[PDB]
Design a protein around this ligand. Structure first.
Ligand SMILES: [Mg+2]
Lengths: 87, 49, 49, 49
DNA sequence: CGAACCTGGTCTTGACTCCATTGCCGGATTTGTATTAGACTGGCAGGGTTGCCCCGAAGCGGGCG
DNA sequence: CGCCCGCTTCGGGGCAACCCTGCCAGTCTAATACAAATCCGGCAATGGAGTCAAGACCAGGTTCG
């Protein structure tokens, strides 16, 4: 049954979620909120730049600046060695 | 040997034979043997989870 | 200190399943203690457990 | 090929029904087999692996 | 003790690009349905041999209103 | 006269161990004619979503008077 639950990717995915929430908690709060809303990690609904700037009450260019700054922070390998093995 | 491998289609048992992984058939007489010991939890293990 | 079971089909009676403490052995054949051959009805003609 | 078909009553009758084949005796995970050899230096509660 | 700096971002504003997303709109293709006027008129066709057990069905000899 | 029931036989379903080990089975009147549906290919309304350039804006760490 090649669509059955493989039972090792599931626990790898749960460990991915735990480690990913830890690494996203290593940042500040506006940053992690922007990342979680930009990639839908809180409900499965991917919020875009205008919704995020609306729910934070700023402009969308500020949201894109914060997005680029944090995604530059995450590509630093100190925030990345614990996630590199997850591909 | 098998820890977790392929699974059967209609029923959801582990598969069979060294060509796949498969497990060994914990058949009916072995169920009788572990009943006769009185090991109830291990029988529940081997037939559910 | 983590025991395993040793089935031998056909499990005629209650002592076909016993629990042994395992230990690591060079090679690929399960080493069985000789004093349970009478319970397992296991000569060493190529029997598998 | 002139093979009789398998109706609903043939899913339960005989040795290949759900009862004798998949309800009572299941393939299990966390399992394995091998050929056996004599272990005359083992303790009684030990075994090879 | 103050002046001036230059730099950490913080945020906004406007201008521009790109891109999905319907919306027609027309041709291609795909699927369904109908119609063929000489006469034609009751199937192939195969297997199947164990033995034992329990039970239920059909039948035959036995007596009888 | 025809009427009914006790043993006999005929048939019919159920069962006959258990581990591994294997892996994918068949065949002919034949096309037109049309219409609904579907689909797919190409511009054409976008406006939303992203992207950059520029700056205003602070208020704090760095240096000169
Ligand atoms: Mg033997």
């Amino acid at each position: 049954d090649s669509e059955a639950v493989v039972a090792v990717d599931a626990v790898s995915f749960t460990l991915l979620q735990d480690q990913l929430q830890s690494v996203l908690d290593t940042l500040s709060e506006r940053e992690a909120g922007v990342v979680r809303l930009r990639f839908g990690l809180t409900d499965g609904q991917p919020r875009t730049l205008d919704e995020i700037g609306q729910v934070y009450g700023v402009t969308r260019e500020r949201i894109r600046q914060i997005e680029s700054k944090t995604m530059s922070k995450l590509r630093h390998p100190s925030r990345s060695q614990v996630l590199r093995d997850y591909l | 040997a098998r820890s977790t491998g392929p699974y059967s289609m209609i029923t959801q048992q582990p598969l069979g034979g060294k060509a796949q992984f498969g497990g060994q058939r914990f058949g009916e007489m072995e169920c009788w043997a572990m009943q006769a010991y009185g090991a109830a939890y291990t029988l529940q293990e081997l037939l559910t989870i | 200190e983590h025991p395993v079971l040793l089935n031998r089909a056909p499990t005629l009676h209650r002592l076909g399943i016993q629990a042994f403490e395992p230990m690591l052995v060079e090679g690929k054949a399960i080493q069985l203690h000789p004093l349970v051959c009478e319970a397992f009805n296991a000569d060493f003609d190529g029997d598998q457990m | 090929g002139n093979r009789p078909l398998k109706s609903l009553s043939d899913l339960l009758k005989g040795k290949q029904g759900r009862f004798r084949q998949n309800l009572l005796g299941k393939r299990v995970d966390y399992s394995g087999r091998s050929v056996i050899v004599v272990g005359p230096q083992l303790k009684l509660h030990q075994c090879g692996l």
